[PDB]
Design a protein around this nucleic acid. Structure first.
Ligand SMILES: Nc1nc2c(ncn2[C@@H]2O[C@H](COP(=O)(O)OP(=O)(O)OP(=O)(O)O)[C@@H](O)[C@H]2O)c(=O)[nH]1
Ligand SMILES: [Mg+2]
Ligand SMILES: [Mg+2]
Ligand SMILES: [Mg+2]
Ligand SMILES: [Mg+2]
Ligand SMILES: [Mg+2]
Ligand SMILES: [Mg+2]
Ligand SMILES: [Mg+2]
Ligand SMILES: [Mg+2]
Ligand SMILES: [Mg+2]
Ligand SMILES: [Mg+2]
Ligand SMILES: [Mg+2]
Lengths: 169, 258, 134, 219
RNA sequence: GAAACUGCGAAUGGCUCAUUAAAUCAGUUAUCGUUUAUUUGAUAGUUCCCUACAUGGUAUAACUGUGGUAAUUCUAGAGCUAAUACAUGCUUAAAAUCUCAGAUGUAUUUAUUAGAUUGAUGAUUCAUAAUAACUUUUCGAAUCGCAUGGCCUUGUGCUGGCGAUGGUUCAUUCAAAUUUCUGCCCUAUCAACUUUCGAUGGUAGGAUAGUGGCCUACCAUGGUUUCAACGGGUAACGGGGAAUAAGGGUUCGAUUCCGGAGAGGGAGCCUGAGAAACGGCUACCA
């Protein structure tokens, strides 16, 4: 619970240049809610022991039992960083800490309306791409919607462990 | 129920305070003190509703906390202090003294008194009893206990307390023909003279009272209060002298101002 | 000028509050709702004291017009005026103005969050920051 | 495993995360108020005798110094006990406390040095924490300074220089039980009141008995 | 002036009407059968078997510092630190009488005496006093603000104000608890009920603050009842009151005031003057 409870977190939220309202988008089975799990573990909200399987953003009973995502659950996180690299930011900056407002979109094609809502409501997009499956149809669709909504993507290539332990490349 | 109550709901207050029905939900609960709950007058009511000095409770509290009000010779800064029958309220600003006595209808009328007579205050002998170590004492109606009293003082007598030393200067003995003042009941506020005292052992002692206009009414011994000798009151009587005129005569007196 | 006749009835002088209480009976033909400020000024002039120990309030305008009746206060001095006037009347008049405090609900939740923390904030904030930062 | 090691003489404390449970097992089956040999805890602890006083297990439960169990139990705690601060006068609450016998379930053990041996250790003896608050009451500060009664302790008292606003105004403790002319006046006033009441009441008794004799003379 | 300790309050208020049919409640009595914080007034020269010009840490909070836990108004260890917190502990002679030099204030408990025909009551073993004693020791300010004065061997002097708070007891006041008399809707398709496990009473004790089968031991065989006991039903909290109202009535009254009960259901209990408290705790059931 790094997580300045609500009050100091909102105090930083007042500084509206070191806040990021971003949404994570990917293909159906590209592993986005697990990456958000690993990101929210550092907020002290879920144990590390249970990060990759406690899909904290997947909140519905179905979302947890079937290992899928349907709705978009917003999670808001506190982030401390170093003085050195905040100088290496091409953005207005006041302070050395940040507030991230993350949206965990569904990957399935049947739930792209939640991705559209998240894009309309956010401004940065984290595009998760499995290294094995590469660029699939749903990642194409979500990146197309983000570019239609004028949202800058940043790409993370996932499942390198799978590529290393299964493909032996 | 589970403890002493600390609020006094309006419409449960004593009637003679003449409180407005629709000002609030509550009436000033008399704090614990000398006289009683029912037959006392809080300084809040006496200062705001009887004298119209204060506009509200904050101003009554300010009056009391600037040591202006002084009851029975002491400041009595409590906002709901139970000032009762014949209590002397001395106000230094607007230097004037009140004796809190029943009017003819039974309410505390606003009755100015002089300083030389306001030096003292009068008390009904509630009991006479020999205390510890063999020291006799007298308890008066106003909760005052006085040591070493005259051995001839019995129950239902009356004593004048100096109010500076709190000691007996002179006293009236309860006998037929003594000026007595009615301190309860339907006849509350009436002044007369004892003619007869029916005993009724075990029950309630009765007394028959014949007022100055020869009207005779009987009241229980508990609420009859001697104030001296006929035509010679040892206290300053109110403007009405406790006559209890019939409504027709009262209406005629009102109509005489025309 | 308009015959704005400010009658003052029922004058009770209570030096207990160092003050004079009365009823003001402003007769104002052909004009409505006489201004509280000009009531204050005229009463100060009539009672030979500054317009800081005179107060007027509670004005009901007579049905039909031409008359308004309220209550008036006259302190002997501005100091006791400031001590005895309620703060709302003082702020209306122009004396020490209103305190900018938060909403009652906020205040209540604020003290409710204080009700949890036992000592001063520093002894627990050190531990909280240390722990969260590892 | 963590250990809060404290060195009370001259004041100090700090924590050691110990691991390699082989070099933890000596701290097992040990009661509270028991001494341990530092050698088994480590060769850098040669000559350290530690008195164990409490600790916290995993899941944060404080341990009770007299339960004598290696498992945590629910106990109804009272005003004058550990592990419970009553939130209302007379309140008693049932809380789970850890037993007095220390085992692997303990997250952190609390231990105080009661003997120093070999080469000193960093942050317990090189550092020294001064006492936060000097004596305030007259006779406590007298006993602290080894003075006698008639030594006028006002002349020198513990004085802290808070150089805050470029004045360096110094604050010293207020003195309690100080012999004061005001306290002596209060004592004299109380004695005078008692004697005056006694004399006045005796005079009243005499004159009332005189009145009784006078009124009984009429027979 | 943070926090904290201390103190006080949180037992009021407010809500609701589930239980409850002689129960609550209304009017009327009693406490000569009890507890009472607070207020108001009065009241305590008696203690000591090398500190009183003022005692102990047997004390600690807050704060510093080391923390555990996911989390709670969670807390442990280490370092202090105070009091009207906790615990101790004298100075007041003088006046005075009994016992063989001591004791004689008050508080607790018992016994005896007085309490008259030297106080009160309608009435007492009452108030109260005295005597002989007994206390896992009660109180009899080791407390605080503001002013400083009078004397004088001019000292670190002796005396001395107004207040606050504390405190034993008594009275009073806010009260509380029991309590007398009479008065509740329908029902006999309820006529006998109660009493082994208290029912009615006697004695003794226990417990209570006090009375009392309230509980126990012994003992008696009682007590309520067609003037309706007991049982059953109430979509019954009681009353002040409300609607309609020639008179008489009929119906309603969960609900602005008073009284009672309860805080999902039962039970138990801490603290406190006051709670069987639930915006207190503990446990069982849901
Ligand atoms: N080998 C490997 N598997 C991964 C990795 N990340 C996720 N997975 C697996 O991929 C599955 C999908 O994970 P999710 O958290 O549901 O994320 P998602 O694929 O975006 O699913 P949706 O949110 O429903 O779209 C999980 O069961 C993981 O086991 C990875 O980095 N390496
Ligand atoms: Mg997911
Ligand atoms: Mg799947
Ligand atoms: Mg009652
Ligand atoms: Mg019902
Ligand atoms: Mg009703
Ligand atoms: Mg109902
Ligand atoms: Mg009610
Ligand atoms: Mg209740
Ligand atoms: Mg409910
Ligand atoms: Mg309860
Ligand atoms: Mg409640």
């Amino acid at each position: 619970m790094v997580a300045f409870t609500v009050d100091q977190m909102r105090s930083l939220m007042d500084k509206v240049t070191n806040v990021r309202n971003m949404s994570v988008i990917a293909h159906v089975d590209h592993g986005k809610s697990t990456l958000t799990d690993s990101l929210v573990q550092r907020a002290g909200i879920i144990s590390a022991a249970k990060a990759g399987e406690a899909r904290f953003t997947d909140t519905r009973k179905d979302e947890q039992e079937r290992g899928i995502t349907i709705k978009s659950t917003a999670i808001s996180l506190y982030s401390e960083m170093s003085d050195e690299d905040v100088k290496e930011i091409k953005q207005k900056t006041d302070g050395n800490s940040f507030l991230i407002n993350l949206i965990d979109s569904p990957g399935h094609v049947d739930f792209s309306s939640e991705v559209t809502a998240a894009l309309r409501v956010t401004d940065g997009a984290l595009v998760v791409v499995d290294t094995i499956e590469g660029v699939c149809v749903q990642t194409e669709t979500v990146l197309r919607q983000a570019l239609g909504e004028r949202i800058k993507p940043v790409v993370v290539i996932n499942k390198v462990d799978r590529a290393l332990l299964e493909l032996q490349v | 129920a589970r403890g002493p109550k600390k609020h006094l709901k309006r419409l449960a207050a004593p009637h003679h305070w003449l409180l407005d029905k629709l000002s609030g939900c509550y009436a000033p609960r008399p704090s614990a003190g000398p006289h009683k709950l029912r037959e006392s007058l809080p300084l809040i009511v006496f200062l705001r509703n009887r004298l119209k000095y204060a506009l509200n409770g904050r101003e009554v509290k300010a009056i009391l906390m600037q040591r202006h009000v002084k009851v029975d010779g002491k400041v009595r800064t409590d906002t709901t202090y139970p000032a009762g029958f014949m209590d002397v309220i001395t106000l230094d600003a607007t230097n004037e003294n009140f004796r809190l006595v029943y009017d003819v209808k039974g309410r505390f009328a606003v009755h100015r008194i002089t300083d030389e007579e306001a030096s003292y205050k009068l008390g009904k002998v509630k009991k006479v009893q020999l205390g510890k170590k063999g020291v006799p004492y007298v308890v008066t109606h106003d909760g005052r206990t006085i040591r070493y009293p005259d051995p001839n003082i019995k129950v239902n007598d009356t004593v004048k307390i100096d109010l500076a030393s709190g000691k007996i200067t002179d006293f009236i003995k309860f006998d037929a023909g003594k000026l007595v003042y009615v301190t309860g009941g339907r006849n509350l506020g009436r002044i007369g003279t004892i003619v007869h005292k029916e005993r009724h052992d075990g029950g309630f002692d009765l007394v028959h009272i014949k007022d100055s206009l020869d009207n005779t009414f009987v009241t229980r011994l508990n609420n009859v209060f001697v104030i001296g000798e006929q035509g010679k009151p040892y206290i300053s009587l109110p403007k009405g002298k406790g006559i209890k005129l019939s409504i027709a005569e009262e209406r005629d007196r009102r109509r005489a101002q025309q | 000028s308009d015959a704005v006749t400010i009658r003052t009835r029922k004058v009770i002088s209570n030096p207990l509050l160092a003050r004079k209480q009365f009823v003001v009976d402003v007769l104002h033909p052909n004009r409505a709702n006489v201004s509280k400020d000009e009531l204050r000024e005229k009463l100060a002039e009539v009672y030979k004291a500054e317009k800081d120990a005179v107060s007027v309030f509670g004005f009901r305008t007579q049905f039909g017009g031409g008359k308004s009746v309220g209550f008036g206060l006259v302190y002997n001095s501005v100091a006791e005026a400031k001590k005895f006037e309620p703060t709302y009347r003082l702020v209306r008049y122009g004396l020490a103005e209103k305190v900018e405090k938060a909403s009652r609900q906020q205040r209540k939740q604020k003290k409710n969050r204080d009700k949890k923390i036992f000592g001063t904030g520093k002894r627990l904030a050190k531990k909280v920051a240390r722990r969260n930062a590892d | 495993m963590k250990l809060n090691i404290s060195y009370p003489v001259n004041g100090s404390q700090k924590t050691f995360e110990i691991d390699d449970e082989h070099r933890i097992r000596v701290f097992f089956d040990k009661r509270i108020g028991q001494e341990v040999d530092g050698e088994a805890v480590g060769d850098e602890f040669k000559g350290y005798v530690f008195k164990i006083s409490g600790g916290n297990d995993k899941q944060g439960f404080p341990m009770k110094q007299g339960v004598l169990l290696p498992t945590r139990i629910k106990l109804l705690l009272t005003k004058n006990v550990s592990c419970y601060r009553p939130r209302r006068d007379g309140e008693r609450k049932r809380k789970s406390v850890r037993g007095a016998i220390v085992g692997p379930d303990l997250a952190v053990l609390a231990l105080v040095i009661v003997k120093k041996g070999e080469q000193e250790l960093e942050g317990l003896t090189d550092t020294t924490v001064p006492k936060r608050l000097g004596p305030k009451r007259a006779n406590n500060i007298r006993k602290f300074f080894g003075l006698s009664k008639e030594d006028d302790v006002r002349d020198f008292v513990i004085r802290r220089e808070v150089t805050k606003g470029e004045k360096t105004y110094t604050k010293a403790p207020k003195i309690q039980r100080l012999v004061t002319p005001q306290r002596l006046q209060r004592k004299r006033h109380q004695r005078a009141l008692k004697v005056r009441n006694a004399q006045a009441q005796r005079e009243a008794a005499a004159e009332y008995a005189q009145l009784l004799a006078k009124r009984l003379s009429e027979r």
